[PDB]
Symmetry: D3
Subunit: 57 residues, 6 copies
C-alpha cells in the first residue's frame, strides 16, 4: 500500500518519523499485509496553502 | 469535499487566499454542501517540476 | 492549474458538471489565468472509503 | 491531517473500515492532533492499474 | 519513485499494461534508479469527471 | 493525461528535465495520444518525508 498524508507544517523530525512508522504499522495490521510493502509519503502544507470553510487555518 | 489545486509558483499570498475561498464557495454552491465541510489544498510547483508536451512551461 | 476534487459519490452528472465549471471559473478568476488552461479532476469516494475521526462519514 | 491510502482492491468493507480507524488513531497519536480533525481516503487500485518494476503486481 | 497517471477511461488492459512498463522504464532511465523500485498507479477518469476550461473533455 | 511522479530530492535540473520528456513520450506512445496533451508533475520528497517498511529511506 501507498499512503500520502497531508499535514500542516511545524512538526519536528521526530513526530514525522513516528508518524511514518505508526501509520505503516496500522496499515500492515489492518490489511494483514507485509510491513515492508507499505510506503508512506508526508506532504507538508504552509498555513497559506490550506483552507477550511474558505478561510485559512 | 477535499480539493487539491496544483498551481505554478509565483502567485502572492493574496491571490492564493482568494483562490481558496472562491473555489470553496464554488464547491459549496455546486454541490449544495456546507461551506464549512470544504477543504482546499494548494500545491505549488517549481518551473522545473511541471511539463507540457514533454517540455518545461 | 490542475484541480483534483475528492467528493462522496452520489451526485448526478449535471451536478458534477456544474462543479467542474464553477471551480474552473473560480480558479481562473483568482489567478488571472486562461480558463482553457484550467483542468479539473473529480474523484468520487464511496461511503466506505471516507472517514472523519476514524469513523466512516 | 488528510491521508489518501492507495491499496489493491479486494478487501472487505470490514477490513477497509479497520484500516480507516487504525490509521486515524495512528495519525492522531504521532502528531498530538484531534482525532476528529483527521480524514482518511481509501483509493482502491485494480490489479491492472498497479505496477512494480513495470510489471503488474 | 511513485507515479500516478490520470487518464480518461476506455483503454484496454493491454494498453494500460504497455503504459505501466514504458513509463517505468522511462523513470528508471532518467533517474538511474532501480526498475524494481519504480511503482506506477493508473487512475482512470470518466468522461464526466475530467474538464478542460470548465467544459467536459 | 496527467502524471504526477513522487521522487526523492537530490536530482539535478537536467535529470528531472529528462524525466518529464521521456515519461511524456512513453505516455504518448503507449496511449497513442497527442504528446501536447500530456502533462507531468514532479513532486520532490525530503528524506524525512518518505518511509519504507515504517522506516526512513
Amino acid at each position: 500500500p501507498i499512503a500520502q498524508i497531508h499535514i500542516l507544517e511545524g512538526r519536528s523530525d521526530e513526530q514525522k518519523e513516528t508518524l511514518i512508522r505508526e501509520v505503516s504499522e496500522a496499515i500492515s495490521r489492518s490489511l494483514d499485509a507485509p510491513l515492508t510493502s507499505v510506503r508512506v509519503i508526508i506532504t507538508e502544507m504552509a498555513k497559506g496553502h490550506f483552507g477550511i470553510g474558505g478561510e485559512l487555518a
